[PDB]
A paper describes a structure:
The Haemophilus surface fibril (Hsf) is an unusually large trimeric autotransporter adhesin (TAA) expressed by the most virulent strains of H. influenzae. Hsf is known to mediate adhesion between pathogen and host, allowing the establishment of potentially deadly diseases such as epiglottitis, meningitis and pneumonia. TAAs, which are part of the type V family of secreted proteins, have three major types of domains arranged in a linear fibril ‘lollipop’ structure. The two binding domains of Hia (HiaBD1 and HiaBD2) have also been identified in Hsf; unlike Hia, however, Hsf has an additional binding domain (HsfBD3) and three putative domains, the structure and function of which are unknown.
Numbering used by the authors:
A (entry chain C): 1607 to 1697, 1703 to 1744
B (entry chain B): 1607 to 1697, 1704 to 1744
C (entry chain A): 1607 to 1623, 1625 to 1697, 1703 to 1743
Write the structure that this text describes.
């Protein structure tokens, strides 16, 4: 009887006999991959390790990770929670706006901010000008 | 022959002999975790159940879920589709999820101009309207 | 002696034998593909049955209801192609995905000011330029 896996990356089955005889244990585990991220954009281990060098510290085990294995709930959740779109900050680079981050469209000098949300969920942002007298 | 699993959270293997005498069935399954969300931010079961109290009803089974198990496609899809960034509503916050249309329109004495570069980068610019 | 799986969609266990005496047991994990359209994530069946325009979905993915597990690449590719749409005046709509730079620039008689607080909260304000 042989025990082989469908996909070597998703499922890992190893048979050992660490009892020096007659006791054959079959270890069945799920190989999981880690999801990385940078500048609000999700990256794999190999991509982030090979393409980016600045400000990032990637381990050797994560460096060889090409993201072909499965993922847990926590990994996905944290990945999305660290992912989003970047906005240009004036004072002159970029700031990462992830999911759940509050963005307030306020009014300033001689302007009137009007941000509305329809029942369909569609967002309409509009600025007005006030000219009296 | 022994049948043990690598990780108890990702994989669950149970050996039983309930199917009558001499018939020993080995059930091998993958333990999956559920993904929750609130205000466009993804939370685990335990996180959503324990941190937030208002307007939310989380079951006891989901309350103990720490998200150490695997996840299915539909769960991830719905989670992302219920996740996004919040905007201040002037009338108090509104959740902007994936795929929802955000229209930058112009109003009184203003001119909306939203352009899309080849890089995919969006440039939003407002103008003032002074004719004659 | 039976080898059965808990969920047929998440886990697949098959016992096979080509001639006599060699019985191999293949255990693999059935994975589902995550699709997307207009920045919104869809399953295989949903995209295939509900959407007709501009999209070509295979039959194997057409029956996919997204009940199986997912790999890292699938999730990563799915999220990075998902996001929120903005009205472009050229018009129509434009899909803004994750990691995409959105610059609030100033124009005629306007002054753009986008600031980021310590909380990470973004405050965008427009000013008027009257010299």
């Amino acid at each position: 009887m042989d025990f082989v896996s469908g996909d070597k990356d998703t499922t890992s089955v190893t048979v050992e006999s660490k009892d020096n005889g007659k006791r054959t244990e079959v270890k069945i585990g799920a190989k999981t991959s880690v999801i990385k991220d940078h500048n609000g954009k999700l990256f794999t281990g190999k991509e982030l390790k090979d393409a980016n060098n600045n400000g990032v510290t990637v381990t050797e085990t994560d460096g060889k990770d090409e993201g072909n294995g499965l993922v847990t709930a926590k990994a996905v959740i944290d990945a999305v929670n660290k992912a989003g779109w970047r906005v240009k900050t004036t004072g002159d680079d970029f700031a990462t706006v992830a999911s759940g981050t509050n963005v307030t469209f306020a009014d300033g000098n001689g302007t009137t901010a009007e941000v509305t949300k329809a029942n369909d969920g569609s967002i309409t942002v509009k600025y007005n000008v006030k000219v009296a007298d």
